[PDB]
Amino acid sequence: KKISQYACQRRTTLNNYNQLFTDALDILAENDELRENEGSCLAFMRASSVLKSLPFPITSMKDTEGIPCLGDKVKSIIEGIIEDGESSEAKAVLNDERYKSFKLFTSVFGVGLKTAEKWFRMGFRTLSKIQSDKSLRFTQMQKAGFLYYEDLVSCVNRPEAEAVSMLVKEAVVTFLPDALVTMTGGFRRGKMTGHDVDFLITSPEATEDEEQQLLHKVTDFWKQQGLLLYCDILESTFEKFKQPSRKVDALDHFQKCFLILKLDHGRVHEGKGWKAIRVDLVMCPYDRRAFALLGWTGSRQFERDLRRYATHERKMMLDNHALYDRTKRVFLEAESEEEIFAHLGLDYIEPWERNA
DNA sequence: AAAAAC
DNA sequence: TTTTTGGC
DNA sequence: TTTTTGGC
DNA sequence: AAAAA
Ligand SMILES: [Mg+2]
Ligand code: NA
Question: Exposure of A175 by Cβ count < 10 A (0-12 exposed, 13-18 middle, 19+ buried)?
Answer without folding.
Answer: middle
